[PDB]
Amino acid sequence: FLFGSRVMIAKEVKTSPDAKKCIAACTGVPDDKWEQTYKKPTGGIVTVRSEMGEPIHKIATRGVMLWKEFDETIFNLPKN
Amino acid sequence: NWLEEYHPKLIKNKSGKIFVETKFSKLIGRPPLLVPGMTPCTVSPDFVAATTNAGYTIELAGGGYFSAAGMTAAIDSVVSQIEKGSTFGINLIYVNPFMLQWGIPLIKELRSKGYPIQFLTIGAGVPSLEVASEYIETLGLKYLGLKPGSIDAISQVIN
Amino acid sequence: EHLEAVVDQDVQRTCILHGPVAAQFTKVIDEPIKSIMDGIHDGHIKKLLHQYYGDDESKIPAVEYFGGESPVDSAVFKATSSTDEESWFKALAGSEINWRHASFLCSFITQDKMFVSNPIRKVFKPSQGMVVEISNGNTSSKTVVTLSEPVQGELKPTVILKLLKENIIQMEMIENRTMDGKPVSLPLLYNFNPDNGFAPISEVMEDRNQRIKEMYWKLWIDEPFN
Numbered sequence: 229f230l231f232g233s234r235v236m237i238a239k240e241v242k243t244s245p246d247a248k249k250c251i252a253a254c255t256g257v258p259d260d261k262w263e264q265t266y267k268k269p270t271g272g273i274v275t276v277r278s279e280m281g282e283p284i285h286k287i288a289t290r291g292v293m294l295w296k297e298f299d300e301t302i303f304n305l306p307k308n
Numbered sequence: 309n310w311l312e313e314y315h316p317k318l319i320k321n322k323s324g325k326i327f328v329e330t331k332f333s334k335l336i337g338r339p340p341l342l343v344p345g346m347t348p349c350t351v352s353p354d355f356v357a358a359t360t361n362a363g364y365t366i367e368l369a370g371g372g373y374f375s376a377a378g379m380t381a382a383i384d385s386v387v388s389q390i391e392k393g394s395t396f397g398i399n400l401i402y403v404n405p406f407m408l409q410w411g412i413p414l415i416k417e418l419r420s421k422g423y424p425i426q427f428l429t430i431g432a433g434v435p436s437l438e439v440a441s442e443y444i445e446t447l448g449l450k451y452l453g454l455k456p457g458s459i460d461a462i463s464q465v466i467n
Numbered sequence: 468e469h470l471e472a473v474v475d476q477d478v479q480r481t482c483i484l485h486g487p488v489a490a491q492f493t494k495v496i497d498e499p500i501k502s503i504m505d506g507i508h509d510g511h512i513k514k515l516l517h518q519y520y521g522d523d524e525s526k527i528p529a530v531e532y533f534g535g536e537s538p539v540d541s542a543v544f545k546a547t548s549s550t551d552e553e554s555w556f557k558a559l560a561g562s563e564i565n566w567r568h569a570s571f572l573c574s575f576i577t578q579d580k581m582f583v584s585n586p587i588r589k590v591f592k593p594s595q596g597m598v599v600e601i602s603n604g605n606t607s608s609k610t611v612v613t614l615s616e617p618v619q620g621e622l623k624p625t626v627i628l629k630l631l632k633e634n635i636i637q638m639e640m641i642e643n644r645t646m647d648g649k650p651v652s653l654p655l656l657y658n659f660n661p662d663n664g665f666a667p668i669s670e671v672m673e674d675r676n677q678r679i680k681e682m683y684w685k686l687w688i689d690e691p692f693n
């Protein structure tokens with residue numbers, strides 16, 4: 229088994245202390261209620277489209293919430 | 309019978325250290341846990357050394373280095389910190405061919421130079437039968453690690 | 468990881484990746500990476516002793532050095548042109564896990580944090596005429612291997628494997644075509660590490676060239692060594 233998200237809170241990682249504090253503050257969600265990120269923050273995590281449009285899981289901060297809103301308002305909108 | 313064929317065994321080492329012997333842990337002589345490549349997280353060469361000193365296999369975040377010389381300085385910076393004979397591996401992205409135009413022509417050499425980089429991992433995609441062919445013999449890697457995300461990406465690695 | 472480089476030191480602006488399900492296990496802050504990975508591994512150890520070993524460790528098997536296995540008592544072995552290689556190496560390493568087990572099956576030898584092909588596995592490559600001999604194969608400390616290839620027709624000892632003090636693998640690399648005919652032997656030492664499984668054999672590079680210089684002395688120079 230590989231452990232991605234379990235690690236980012238360790239002391240040997242380089243994430244800033246405030247970033248760890250919030251990544252701890254957010255309570256996860258069990259797999260049964262997993263897909264509800266596309267719609268809402270699920271215990272503090274959403275998915276957003278990349279610049280390639282492909283999804284990315286991010287902690288639901290004010291910044292990434294604005295990102296989400298812009299995705300479904302500005303960039304989804306066509307070229308002209 | 310998969311319940312017995314791959315039963316998770318237990319192993320004692322001469323030092324008296326316990327181990328979870330699996331098929332995977334029996335190539336790496338290391339617990340069957342690893343940290344995947346993480347461009348914000350496993351890019352910091354001092355952290356990728358801190359865990360491999362704990363004795364857990366790690367991938368080095370390739371996507372965090374925009375060059376060939378930068379990741380080389382990272383590699384050598386961890387080599388300066390890992391214990392004698394320790395090992396790590398690197399993680400490459402596949403949707404980023406500019407990321408792949410450094411590593412491969414670099415990995416061939418640092419391996420021919422003999423670095424402790426003893427596995428590769430092509431994340432965010434699966435190569436073709438043709439390009440995924442030379443990574444195991446031109447690259448003196450111990451094993452290769454492919455990230456399936458699809459149901460056909462698994463058929464592909466089986467190919 | 469650079470909140471010093473955001474406008475008002477506010478993380479709430481930042482894009483930080485995480486998992487929706489893994490988040491409900493990450494509550495203690497900044498614990499050492501060894502601490503959490505060990506809390507996982509020994510947790511598995513507790514969960515596996517209670518099932519298949521009855522909470523008594525002594526039920527454990529025992530291995531000299533754990534690892535090195537790809538997923539896929541005093542005898543001799545003559546090798547010829549078609550002598551298969553992997554059977555050959557199996558016949559030489561043996562069944563027991565010891566230094567002899569790795570010396571032919573360990574593919575890489577560390578040279579002070581650098582991994583280069585196994586030399587022993589290079590020299591013992593199966594070919595014609597090589598009559599290798601394993602003596603005293605039961606106990607490891609006294610196990611010695613002697614490859615004697617044909618030289619000028621006759622067979623003479625060319626290679627000698629044996630342990631030393633401190634569990635130091637040495638390959639007595641002999642060459643007999645000498646100025647005085649008496650064979651010269653090149654002592655190549657290696658450190659065997661039962662604790663590092665993936666690469667137990669680590670060549671001592673210290674003083675390595677001098678014992679090569681000293682071997683080449685008696686090959687060329689008709690003078691004392693200095």
Ligand SMILES: Cc1cc2nc3c(=O)[nH]c(=O)nc-3n(C[C@H](O)[C@H](O)[C@H](O)COP(=O)(O)O)c2cc1C
Nearest residue numbers: 231232233344345346347371431432484485486489
């Ligand atoms: C911060 C972060 C960065 C990641 N970077 C990469 C990456 O660069 N390439 C990749 O293939 N996967 C990347 N992953 C995903 C991991 O490879 C792995 O699939 C994921 O961590 C598993 O999810 P988990 O953390 O819930 O266990 C990243 C994950 C995280 C959390």
